[model samples]
Target chain A: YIDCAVIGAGPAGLNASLVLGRARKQIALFDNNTNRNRVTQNSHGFITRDGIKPEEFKEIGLNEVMKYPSVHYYEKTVVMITKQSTGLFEIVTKDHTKYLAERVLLATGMQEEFPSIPNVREYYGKSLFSCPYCDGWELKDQPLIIISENEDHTLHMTKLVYNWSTDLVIATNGNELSQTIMDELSNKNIPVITESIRTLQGEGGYLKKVEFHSGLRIERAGGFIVPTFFRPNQFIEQLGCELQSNGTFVIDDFGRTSEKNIYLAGETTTQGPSSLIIAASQGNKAAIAINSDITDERF
Target chain B: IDCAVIGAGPAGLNASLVLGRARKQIALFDNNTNRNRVTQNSHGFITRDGIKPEEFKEIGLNEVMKYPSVHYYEKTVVMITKQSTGLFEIVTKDHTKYLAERVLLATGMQEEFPSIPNVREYYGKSLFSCPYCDGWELKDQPLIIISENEDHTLHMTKLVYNWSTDLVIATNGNELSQTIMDELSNKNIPVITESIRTLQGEGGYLKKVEFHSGLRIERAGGFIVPTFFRPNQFIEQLGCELQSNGTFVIDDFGRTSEKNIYLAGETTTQGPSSLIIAASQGNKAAIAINSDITDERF
Candidate 1:
């Protein structure tokens, strides 16, 4: 038996586990090694560990949290979570192992599915990226491509990319873009291309050219693409946590979800943007709140 | 100037880093001494858990300065006035003036330590305010909690027990309910209602406590909760709304009641209890501020 079962051992889960461990609470942290940040070379915007590799960040966080004997790390995926008749929660892993805990933290991050563009998987995390805030500084003043599955995200990315470099073109890949948005981009001297992309030509994961189906090839230095963020796991919905229209779990100020004895942090919540530091902060806050909630019951 | 960030702690540094990366011009003002100066080492911040507070700021400032748009200064802000023309006017103790389109108050809280002899000397060495921040270093030791008031101290005393089993509470002659006293006694924890006379320790490490009634008890290190917190005066002068607990009211995005002004880090309603958490809050607030400025231009 444990006080809390934390799913997804990313920044949020690791930080939360570290806090709970310091509080002497029995906590089990579950991770299956699936993370969107695995593609990125180094995470930015973190203070001390700025530009550290995602794997190195995880290692340091796990090493620190393991200093406390109260936390247990598991490398298995949690398949389902259900409320027990005795008011406790039951967590079942993929291998039929079961654990019981008083509280649950869904730090399970969102799943990012890259668009079906030729050679996009090769250039991702290298010359091609999503967030301009994270990778824009690296691609500053270089000609770049802005691509997205939806018009809203594409329009926003184009405007944000202009801060890093004025030389940018949008690859809608035949997706419909409103004329008002196009006029806005034209006013800013940005061009929107509607032709389908044939292939991305690059060497050693650095993009050099983007070829279109109309036999038009453009020289490109780097690119930005918005991937679809999918909530893969069903446990959150199974536990009856309310989700927003965008599929992000709705959480209160303290990371409390709609369900009782359940909490959320990281990119799964709608608190802020998806940064490593932001996720860790959310996890830390949830851990503090969870500890207080447990104390409220025990005392 | 774009934004004037007061305080160069983790919060101010992170906010400045994000803003500079976003191409926003910023001025970061820092004072060398602060509330965290009493502590020799900061704990619980991952990847830099045992780092000195000063070292953390140095590394953060170096990274933020790489963007070139952020200017750092070693100065103290004396006053802040919002101009009717929507600009913020700031005056520093060094007799320098700065004007920014927006202001950020990351000027953290000031702590009023309890007046006990030799307590301040042992503060950062062997005594602390947060158990989750420093308790792992003092685990399983005989600990004491110098508490006061009623409800707040009572709840904290119970929570501190998780760090150490052998614990005692000193109320400093303050009135506490019998029900609360009985609960402590039921757990075999002793309570000393006498006021603290002095703390005896060796080289800044706590060893024993002497009560006003001449009762002496042996212990090793402990924790003390600050009696009162004084927010930086510039906040009130700027007409920001404050909560009943004295925290400035801020939206989740770090916007204060005053428009074109933002607050972040430990001084706001969403202040987290850890340094890393505060740094993250600063980054989030900077993003919102950048968006607002960009909207104003584009």
Candidate 2:
């Protein structure tokens, strides 16, 4: 069995693969050419790689991990991951071939589902974004809109977004807000637009206006949307690891899950361009743990 | 008055970038004596593999300064006092002072090199501490493992053997149990207990190791068993709890026992990590620091 089978090519998996390869661990890195950060013009907060395009970042990372001869590269999608009685995980891919890994790392990130508001896909990562800490600086001081139907989330996001742009409108599609929150928002000069949004109108992927079903419109330059996230793969449940209410896996500091010899990192474990660095670091830590465990078990 | 980041290494710089991007006003302090100053090229950090230490800091500082709220100071921090008003009174060696709502002691550790002659001459060039950082370049070459600690050297021998089979364990005049020596003999590795006379090399490149008994052995380069002490009296002055390992007692996000005082980077445990992990710690702590401030204000 190989030392490790890392299942993703994002920052987390790539860094983990690099560390494992350096430690003389025979590792296999699987990638289906899918990375999570696709639409952003520039990813921020990762030191030295700040404002880098997502594609370029991945390319450089993949190149670095492949430098070591011990890391085997695969361009295939993983179909299922099940634990064998021998404590090794059987990683089966689309081609119907299977490989047994002494350890498995689930760095395949979460899948993002956009809101029902029409044409949001076009403006996402452009005039609209998720995770303010990632794109907040670029949108600083611009008139903005925050789309969140959850009442509790709206208040917290508003308070945080207020730091970037004082002029913000809370757009809750058809959701009613309590009078207590409405008055508090009014005092901050932030308007609460509870009308159901029909479509997001913009030019060249930059949001210009929001059209409601009642023919009302409000113009905005850029904004943030509270998107939902879910697991992109079936491995976590199949391997029998517990997840938190938010869909993140239960992991130690090094990203080891409840399952022995199984580790998860990247967006799959925590909550962004603020993410790339954290995920990569998580991979580094997990690789160390995996190598140390194998080393301890061996002579 | 939002936060003050002390030390401009990977952890400190990344923290400043996150805080500044969140529009938190911050001042980054650097006496410019970084922990990785002796490092030639940092490895394993994606996008920055084999990058020189100086260039990494220069680029990171430029990115952080792009935010109008982030400021850079070239002064060394002298003292930090948690005032009764719940703020930090920071004083620098230049006799300048500033006040901030919170302080980040990214103050890195200090290295205590072994008392051997000319060890510093080849520190970053031929001799290094972390094999993960420099082992790949010296792989498959005859190398020496120097450590006064027997247990640590035994551990290093096993790990280093993976990179190069031709390895020698140099105790630098320390005792090893008879059982451990037998274990080394079985593996064809030799244990030398003689005290090192000096390391003779040409301009920072290790050539040969000479012992006091006039026994000389030629080897390419090797690693020293690492030891560290957390510098900066602010950690003690702030009264933060420390673990038995000499690292500050903090949560996963770097919240120390001292209120309004946070620690990140090398100062925390696992200080000898790579640039990427250290930067990650700074990023995590910066988010926690920003969230705490947001909670208080909101």
Candidate 3:
């Protein structure tokens, strides 16, 4: 039996695989290639690899982990993970192959669902972005749209976006903004548009303007959209781990979940800053903990 | 008058990069050498595995230097004096002085090498402390483990067996319990209790060991369990609480006990598994430091 069965092949799973592999632990890393950063052309804020393509980052990481012979790389998706009576985890993939492991790591990244705005998909990663830390510097001093469905999120995102640009409009898509929030935005000289967005007009994946209902149109260079993140996979809940109200699994400092023999890392855990470097660090910690636990048990 | 980052390792460099990208003016002080210098190549750091330690530093510092806000210096830190005006004044070895609103300590541990002839030469090239970092490269080869009296040594020895079966244990004259001795013999691994006289190696690559009792044994490579580690003494001068293991106490966000100061990397924690992990911690701490400073402003 393998020592660890890592579910995802993102930064978290890849770093964990590296650690476990070097420790001579038999590890099976599963990757479905459905990463959240697939929409973006380049990832930022990671030291030494700022502005690196997401695919290039994955390739470099995979090549490094492959150097250790103990790591087995699998491209198939893990459909179901069940705990056996003998305290081992049985990971079943869609290809009908089963692998057993003593410990399991849940690194399945978040699944993002965009709002029902026309032409958003075209400019989502190119012109429009979500995280300011990842894309704000690139959009500094440019006119942008701050789109969000929630009033509280809209207020906070406006303040964060202000650090990059002074010219901004909060487009709520017909969602009403509270009076106090509107007053705050007005004091900052930021425009507020409550009309329903008709379409995002762009050319070659670069946003141009936001066409609204009632024939109102406003020009915008780019924008930030607070997309809703849906929890990916049912393994965490099935394994009896407690999740927070926001659907993120509750985890400790070591990324250990409430369930025994199960751990969570990356976007799956609530404590991370949702950055690539932070996710990789959490994965490294989880692998170290899992290795120590295994050594204590069978050594 | 911004943040003053001490040390220029992975953590310090990454933290300075984040702070610089955030548009913060900072000063970075580096002594140019630390504990990791002994290792010929660093591993377990993804995207840059098996890279020379010096080359890794150059790449990271070059990236951080892309932002003009970060000032890099190769001088050593002499002292950090906290003024009553709530600012930190850093004194360098070259007699230059700089004042900053905040401080970040990334000074790594100081390793006290064992007194053995030619051992220092072979340390980074063929000897290492962490098995998980270098074991994969040395797998399936005959090796030796230089152990100590620590309780965790037994547990670690058992795990090291997975890397290579043809392993021997060197105790350096320390006593081993009878039960543990039986376990080593059962695995067909010999345990040597003689004190080490010297290390016989060729140009920083280990070849064999010379015992004090006029016995010489040939071995390809081995690992060492450092008995004592001197932490960065500047933390004590700054009045930071330390854990029993000699690691500086830090909050989840890398805040130290003292005000207007933060800590990051291996110096702040028990064991930073690799350079990548230390770099990630520095990034996390930098974000926290930025948020705290921004919160106080508005």
Candidate 4:
């Protein structure tokens, strides 16, 4: 039995794994080569790693995680997890191997699912995006567009996005938006378009203009979309941990969920680019609770 | 007038300053440098930009703070802080400061007094509490956490990630927790949980911990300990919420008692690792506090 098993090797899980190893606990880390920021060119809002490439960040993070021998690393994905008993959980991987742990940390990242617009997948991470805090500063002062095809994207982008850029254009793609909010956007020079978005025109994966069904082209350097993110894996969900309305695990401030011995961190629990740092920090906190009660130190 | 302020540390004050910048009417921060000067390298944490001891103060505060000059340091505080007319009121060592529309208490402390046997002398230097912040100092060297009433294995395992691939688990020679014992044994991690009923060491150094029933742990580079820190000393009588363990009460984003008040870093839920983690919390605390004062646009 392991003291803790951290699922996923992203920044949060990696950092937590580091802390657990340093604390002298037996820890196992499982990954399936899937990282949330794999496609992104740069990861922003990180303290020292701001503007650094996502893969470079992962390389350094993995190097750090490998430095600890107590941490068992496996290239496996945990597919099912359930509470075996109080403070103990049983995890089954995709390969049908079972592992047991007193405490579990879910750092399984969210999957950014795009709205079925034509060719939007080709520009994801380069031009079409989800989070403003992650890419806003680099696209600052440049003309930006919002493809608010879904309800979440429409409201959140329209309300909170003024922080990143003033010259903002929101395209609803024939979806109905509140008229009062539309008037509010016009007052701020933020044009709200309600036409069907047909395709995107860009070179080398960088967005140039958005083509509508009406044959009208609107210029944009880069844009955001409402991507549906999930746990990528549902093991934690099977463990009866609370899930937020948005599908991430509802963990407390210290990263504790409804389950007793399980802790959740990173984008899979509560996250964003603004959240990664604290997510990593929450991993550290969860490690604290996991380590605070130990035996065999005597004799 | 913004929220109330607590510690003068970079985390606490920076958070308060963020609130001030957002045009929130509140008076935050208390006056205390606490202790001075003792650390080697302070890296891995973000954004202070190669800052050294005493340098990480109020730089982020420049973005806010109406007077900046009005926030002072080194004043002794006395009595309980009462919220009169919905404003946080306090009487300190010097005079009475009142009418805080919101309160941001970033006032924090250290494990200066641990009540341990001869442990306080070398704290912050040769002997440390957090592994993430000080683990590099003890990396690959013999390190042990003096765990007593609290479970020790969790801390030991976490510290192993920071420094010293080889470590010694010293419970100060006390009984170990079953959860820790079983976990450590399965992982093949070694532990020594006998009571150190005796001890002998020098200034700025701890050679070995001697046990009562006959067992002596030889020289370890330094020790990591689960500290019994009183996060609130500057304003304990202020009637702020504290956990059953006397830890300062904190919300999801590290806010505390009194309307529009906040707390951050070790002052709230302290785990004693990750300087980067603490700074991350400090930044979140700052943003959360900042949002509270702004219009609903956030």
Candidate 5:
């Protein structure tokens, strides 16, 4: 059996692979080639790599991890994982291939479930997104719209955008904000718009303005969209790992799940808007913990 | 009367300055800038803008916090601290300057100590705590793990063994189990149970560890022992927050015991060092504390 198998080639998985490989573990990093922040333009919250394009950061991380001789990567996604009779885990790929390893790391990030708004999908990569931190600096001090659907979106999204731009419009999608909350926004000069968004009209496939079903258009430099991200991959859950209220895998200080041999990191475990730096860190931490386990187990 | 900054460095005052520029209250602390003193190079961790060791914290610090709303200082060694008079209070280096409002201890890193001899003298250059931070250049080479302390030795031994195939563990003065010894011996790991008193080296360069209790072994690549670290001068009594070892007592979110007090970086952990990890902690602590203040008004 192999020493370790890390799922996903994004920041978290790639970072862990680098560590595990250096540790001399016979390891394989699997990726479907889909990164969490593929749509975002510039990334932030990371130190030296701040403001780097999301794709470029992934490229660097993958390049660094692959430098080690022990690290191997497969450009295929894992379909299912089951424990074999030997007690080591057996992982099957989408292409009907199998591999066995003593340890597994799930960096299979979450999927975005955006609101079903007409023309919203077209403006996704160009205008709308979940993280303001990733895109906020680029569009700072510009007028923006946040189509908040519920309670969580209303508070945090407004607060997050406040870091970039002082003037912000919080659209409740279809629900109106509470009166006290409305007063709070007014005190800060941030407007609260409760009108339901019918569709956003765009120019040349880029967001030109956000149009409401109420027949008004707020011409602005795009905006933050709080889409419900879904944890479609539940391998961590099936392995009896505890899940946070947001449905992501819950990890302790060591990035360990309830299951003994499994570790989780990246978008699959952390909550809220996680930048590349945070994800890469989670991957690195989990790998250290995993290496420690191998240490105790063997010596 | 201002934002009482406990430590004067990148994290503490940079945060205070951010709020201050936004025209919020601020106070900064500095014990004459020796944090991160031993670092040869600061890489991966961002926003120093490629400045030198002394200038790294100065570039963004002074101008940001030198405004009318903020106050900052040096050599204020705080002795006694309590949340007295409706705000956090502290006694300074002269032990007489009692200041109040919010406190931020930016006390940074110290050294990692190994129980083995000569380990401390070679820290920051040869011996290390993190593999990810320094493991790249040393990959696929022979390494020595001088396991003098039980837990730290086993950890360094096993973790270091992962990187290099040829690993030797010198459990100085302590006896290891037959199972563990046999496992390493079977794996071709040369195990030495001799207690090493000193290491043969030149000019702080570790050449080999010498044992008085058992057979001697020579190593080309150096050794690793988890060291003892302290955030002593700045963190001990800042705002009367408790200190565990030398690290400021902080929660998962990096908040110290004092309400407005916060800490980040190597000052908070005795475990390991990863520039990315420390950078992330710094960012989180900055964001979390900033959010705490902003959330109250938001």
Candidate 6:
């Protein structure tokens, strides 16, 4: 039996496990090395670790949390979690090993599925990125492509990207962008290319041009593509935690879910792409609350 | 001219970094009076976990100064007033002054250690206010928990029990309910109702606890549930609305009632002050402050 099982090794999961381990709670930290940050080279906006590689950050957290004897580490994917009749949680890894814990933290963060444009994956982290704030400065003042399947996200990204660059063209990629939004883009001198993208042509993962199905090839330097974040695992559905309208789990100020004993942090509770500091901060707060909750029960 | 961050702790430092990265010109002020100046290792921040406090500040300040827009002033801000022209006039202890459109108070909280002889000598070395920050270092040792408040004494006992099973609770001559005493007795934890005469420790590391009646107890180190207070006059000088618990009334973004005034870290936080949370508040506050600037310009 363990005090809690952290089901992800992202910023949220690692920080929470470190806090719990420091508090002397028996912690089992689970990671299958499928964190979404693996797609990017540098993560930005985190305080000291700004522009740090995702792997470097994860390694540092792993080293720090393991110093505490209370924390245990596992390299297996958690397959299922069952809420026992006696109020304990049965966590089963892919290896068929099972363990019971008093609490479960679902920090298995959201995964991003890149768009299906041919050869788009080649320039994802190099020339194509999701967040403007994260990769905007590097792509500033260049001819760029703003692509998104979601209408609202596309417009917002257009406005935000405008702060960094002016020569940006919007590609709806067959998603109906309303006429009103087109007028707004036209007013800002940002062209709206509603054509479906056929392929992305680049050299050595550096994008050079984007081709449309209508035989129109537009020269570009780099681009921003809004990604659709999806739950990477089936645990949230199996646990029956109430979710918000935006597909994020409904959480309290301390990251507690409607189904008590199950808490969430980081990208699980947030709707869109956010900073590493934000995710780690949420993890710290939730871990503190969880430890306090456990201490209260013991008393 | 854009924003001024008062105090260069984790909150102010992180805010300056974010604001500077956002292309906002900032003036960061501090006299090096950190709240955790006496403490040793700072913990719980993910990447820089268990870093020395001074080294952490040096690295953070170095990161903040990388952007030319952010300036670090190794001076104390003694006074802050909103000028008639709607800009803030900040007066430092050196009698030097500067102006900005916005101000963020990240000075953090002032603490009052428990009243016991040699308490100050042992504090931050052997005695600490928060168990979570320093407990693991003293784990499995014979520890003493001291607090005059009933609830605090009980809570510290509950928290410290996890770190060390051998525990002693000291109420310091305060009246404790019999039910609470019986609970302590149930767990074989001793309670000393008498006031402490002196803490006998060598070189700031606590070793002996001597009571008023010559009853001496030997222990390794302990935690002091100190009473913390907001000692910053800037809140009242700027007339920021405060909470019932003396914390400034602030929104989710650390924006105080006074539109251009903001507070982060302990001043705005509802929970314990950890470096990560403070730094996170700084990031949120910087984003909100910059957005406000962008909105006005747009």
User: Which runs of model 4 end up more than 4 angstroms from their true locations?
Assistant: A77-103, A150-153, A238-262, A271-274, A293-299, B1-107, B114-120, B130-203, B208-250, B255-262, B269-273, B289-298
Residue B47, candidate 6: alpha-carbon lDDT: 75
Task: Looking at model 2 chain A, report the run of 10 residues with the lowest lDDT sum.
Answer: A243-252
Candidates' TM-scores?
A: 0.93, 0.93, 0.91, 0.68, 0.79, 0.94
Better of 2 and 6 by TM-score: 6
Q: Each model's DockQ?
A: 0.64, 0.72, 0.54, 0.15, 0.27, 0.60
Candidate that would win on TM-score = 6
Best candidate, DockQ: 2
Q: Report lDDT (CA) for all predictions.
A: 0.83, 0.85, 0.82, 0.63, 0.66, 0.84
How big is the positional error of residue A9 in model 1, measured in Å on the Cα after superposition?
2.0
List model 2 lDDT by residue over A1-299, tens digit each.
58899999999999999888888889989998767578778899998888899999998989988888999999999999988888788999999989999899889987767778878888887888878888988899999999998889888888888878899999999898888888888898989988999988878779888888899998899899988877777788898887656545655678877788888878777742338998899889888888777866775
- What TM-score does candidate 4 get on C-alpha atoms? 0.68
Clashing pairs in 3: B38-B124
By DockQ, is 4 or 5 better? Answer: 5
* CA error at residue A203 for candidate 3, angstroms: 2.7
Give candidate 2's TM-score.
0.93
Every model's Cα RMSD, please?
A: 2.6, 2.6, 2.9, 7.5, 5.3, 2.4
Per-residue alpha-carbon lDDT of candidate 1 for residues B202-267, written as tens digits (9 for 90 to 100): 898888899998999998988887854545587778888775655565557788778887888887
| lDDT agreement of model 3 with the native | 0.82
Mind giving the per-residue lDDT tens digits that candidate 5 earns over B188-268?
A: 888777667787667655667678854455665545654545657545455435566454556655687667766665566
Q: How close to the true structure is residue A80 of candidate 3, measured as C-alpha lDDT?
A: 89
Cα lDDT tens digits, model 3, A152-216, are 88887787777678899999987999999899888878989998898878687798888888688
lDDT of 5 by residue, A1-299 (tens): 58889988777787778777766778888887666567656655454443567777777777767766888888886888887778888889889999998999888878878776776766666677666645665566877877778865588778767876786888887786778778877888887767788777667447667777788878777778888876667687566777665455555765787778899878877745575656777877888888888878876
Where's the lowest-lDDT run of ten residues in candidate 5 chain A?
A43-52
Model 1 spans > 4 angstroms off: A82-90, A94-98, A244-251, A271-273, B243-247, B270-272
Error of 2 at B184 (Å): 3.5
Q: What is the TM-score of chain A alone in each candidate?
A: 0.94, 0.94, 0.95, 0.88, 0.92, 0.95
